[PDB]
Design an enzyme around this catalytic site. Structure first.
Site: not given
Ligand SMILES: [Br-]
Ligand SMILES: [Br-]
Ligand SMILES: [Br-]
Ligand SMILES: [Br-]
Length: 283
Positions: A227, A221
């Site tokens: 994430r 990410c």
């Molecule tokens: Br991120």
């Protein structure tokens, strides 16, 4: 935690919501690795300082992805990328969890994909999100590009509403391999997705695409923790579900926390994994 049979997972999650018990559970995730002798000397070495996108996000020494050494004019270390091997559902080192490359680390990133026999990249960020720089474009906009000794060619791109697939070739020009990138393009710039199905769908398509991959899947990410961690847990738990009809977010997460700092960084993300899987199970 115990494996929760899928049949009891919805209630387990509803009970966590009603007791406000996610805060306490996520708090034990956060402290679960303080006693293990973990170090991050490489990440803190002066030679590597500009290779880290964030100063508080390090790659633990025992699980960091090592690049082969080069002896350069400057005499400085070249074995380092901010990324870590992370375990999957009964598959040791199933993932590399990585920060989004900087312009100054894009060559390192491709060299990691070459040396570690990576054939799939999963990207869960946009490059810029509401004025915040998250990730540098490390792949050619059109045609071909060189990143040192690594020639990347973009053979084709399929754009869908929630993710894009880019199909590249990678060549080491000091001597072709296919690398496929699954880029989720609709993660909101704050918080977590309001609707889980598009994320589920992305995870399933990626999982199909990597199903015979012999080496690790690279997941990033921006920082490569929040994430990234959320994807890793979802992907691994979909495997657990299919093969044992159970789910073990809490125990799985605690284990991978030993491999990279802050994987699943926020309580919101913790909660979102649970909500997404309830939804998956209920259809
Ligand atoms: Br991120
Ligand atoms: Br490891
Ligand atoms: Br950047
Ligand atoms: Br090289």
């Amino acid at each position: 935690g115990p494996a929760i049979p899928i049949k009891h997972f919805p209630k387990h999650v509803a009970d966590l919501h009603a007791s406000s018990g996610f805060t306490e559970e996520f708090e034990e995730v956060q402290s679960c690795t303080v006693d293990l002798g973990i170090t991050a000397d490489s990440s803190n070495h002066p030679d590597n300082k500009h290779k880290n996108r964030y100063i508080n996000i390090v790659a633990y020494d025992h699980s960091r992805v090592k690049l082969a050494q080069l002896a350069e004019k400057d005499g400085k270390l070249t074995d380092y990328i901010n990324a870590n091997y992370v375990d999957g559902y009964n598959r040791p080192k199933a993932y590399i969890a990585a920060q989004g490359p900087l312009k100054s680390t894009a060559e390192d990133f491709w060299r990691m994909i070459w040396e570690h026999n990576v054939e799939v990249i999963v990207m869960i960020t946009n490059l810029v999100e509401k004025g915040r720089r998250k990730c540098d474009q490390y792949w050619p906009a059109d045609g071909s590009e060189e990143y040192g000794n690594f020639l990347v060619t973009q053979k084709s791109v399929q754009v869908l509403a929630y993710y894009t697939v880019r199909n590249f070739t990678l060549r080491n020009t000091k001597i072709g391999r296919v690398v496929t990138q699954y880029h989720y393009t609709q993660w909101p710039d704050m918080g977590v997705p309001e609707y889980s199905l598009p994320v589920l769908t992305f995870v399933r398509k990626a999982a199909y695409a990597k199903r015979h991959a012999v080496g690790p899947v690279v997941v990033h990410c921006s920082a490569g923790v929040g994430r990234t961690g959320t994807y890793i847990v979802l992907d691994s738990m979909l495997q657990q579900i299919q093969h044992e009809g159970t789910v073990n977010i809490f125990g799985f997460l605690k284990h991978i926390r030993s491999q990279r700092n802050y994987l699943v960084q926020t309580e919101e993300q913790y909660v979102f994994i649970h909500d997404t899987l309830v939804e998956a199970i209920l259809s």
